[PDB]
């Protein structure tokens, strides 16, 4: 595959997000590297506007599935890498149960040797004292499966999954994800058969970082075929 070759080694990653949740505006910058051979991602995110108005875990999914490890026997189903270097647009609506929703639009593409994820996020209908704006979510992350289906109509894919964020009282805050990806270029891409990505994420802090931030270590592997 075309893009396939772009991911054989360690690739630097840059993430830039501008967000507005219920009028609370903020920006985040992230840097790190991905090693698709091992489905590995290592990144550090910094809120460059001061304090993040929402819990960091709620932004993990928004912050480059092209770094997922696709088993050799499943390479023909790797839409993400096939869209590179031109990239793909990734759009989501994330519904937080009994609370508001995030709508995101992002462009993932290479800028030189760096894989960049530029995101615009808009959140509305949140409860000021809810689990999100109220900061009631634990700083951790559960393993989840991400379900992918082709969408030949748009020469792209449809993705859906549920993220369960742990609330400090022991309960869970469901975040229902509806996602669509379509190529940026007019080039050809690989439309996959149904499969899923198995994802695990570990959140941590940089003991010397005084800015509001998040350190992320993530491993993702395609499966189901």
Swiss-Prot record:
Documented applications: Green fluorescent protein has been engineered to produce a vast number of variously colored mutants, fusion proteins, and biosensors. Further generation of mutants led to more stable proteins (at 37 degrees Celsius for example) with brighter fluorescence and longer fluorescence lifetimes.
Effect after changing residue 99 to E: In mut1.27; shifts fluorescence lifetime from 3.03 to 2.85 ns
Effect caused by changing residue 65 to L: In RSGFP4; increases fluorescence and shifts the major exitation peak to 489-490 nm
Impact noted for substituting residue 194 to S: In EBFP1.2; shifts the excitation and emission spectra to shorter wavelengths and increases quantum yields compared to BFP
Impact upon substituting residue 202 to K: Abolishes the tendency to dimerize and leads to monomeric fluorescent proteins
Outcome recorded upon mutating residue 141 to C: In mut1.9; shifts fluorescence lifetime from 3.03 to 2.74 ns
Pfam families: GFP (PF01353)
Task of the protein: Energy-transfer acceptor. Its role is to transduce the blue chemiluminescence of the protein aequorin into green fluorescent light by energy transfer. Fluoresces in vivo upon receiving energy from the Ca(2+)-activated photoprotein aequorin.
Protein name (record): Green fluorescent protein
Name of encoding gene: GFP
């Amino acid at each position: 595959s075309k893009g396939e070759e772009l991911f054989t080694g360690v690739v630097p990653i840059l993430v830039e997000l501008d967000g507005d949740v219920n009028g609370h505006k903020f920006s985040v910058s992230g840097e790190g590297e991905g090693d698709a051979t091992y489905g590995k991602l290592t990144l550090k995110f910094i809120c460059t506007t001061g304090k993040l108005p929402v819990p960091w875990p709620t932004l993990v999914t928004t912050f480059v599935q092209c770094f997922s490890r696709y088993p050799d026997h499943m390479k023909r189903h790797d839409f993400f890498k096939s869209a590179m270097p031109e990239g793909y647009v990734q759009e989501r609506t994330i519904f937080f149960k009994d609370d508001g929703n995030y709508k995101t639009r992002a462009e993932v593409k290479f800028e030189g040797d760096t894989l960049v994820n530029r995101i615009e996020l808009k959140g509305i209908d949140f409860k000021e004292d809810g689990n999100i704006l109220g900061h009631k979510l634990e700083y951790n992350y559960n393993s989840h499966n991400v379900y992918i289906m082709a969408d030949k109509q748009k020469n792209g894919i449809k993705v859906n999954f549920k993220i369960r964020h742990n609330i400090e009282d022991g309960s869970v805050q469901l975040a229902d994800h509806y996602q669509q990806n379509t190529p940026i270029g007019d080039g050809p891409v690989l439309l996959p058969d149904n499969h899923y990505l198995s994802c695990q994420s570990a959140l941590s802090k940089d003991p010397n970082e005084k800015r509001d931030h998040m350190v992320l270590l993530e491993f993702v592997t395609a499966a189901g075929i």
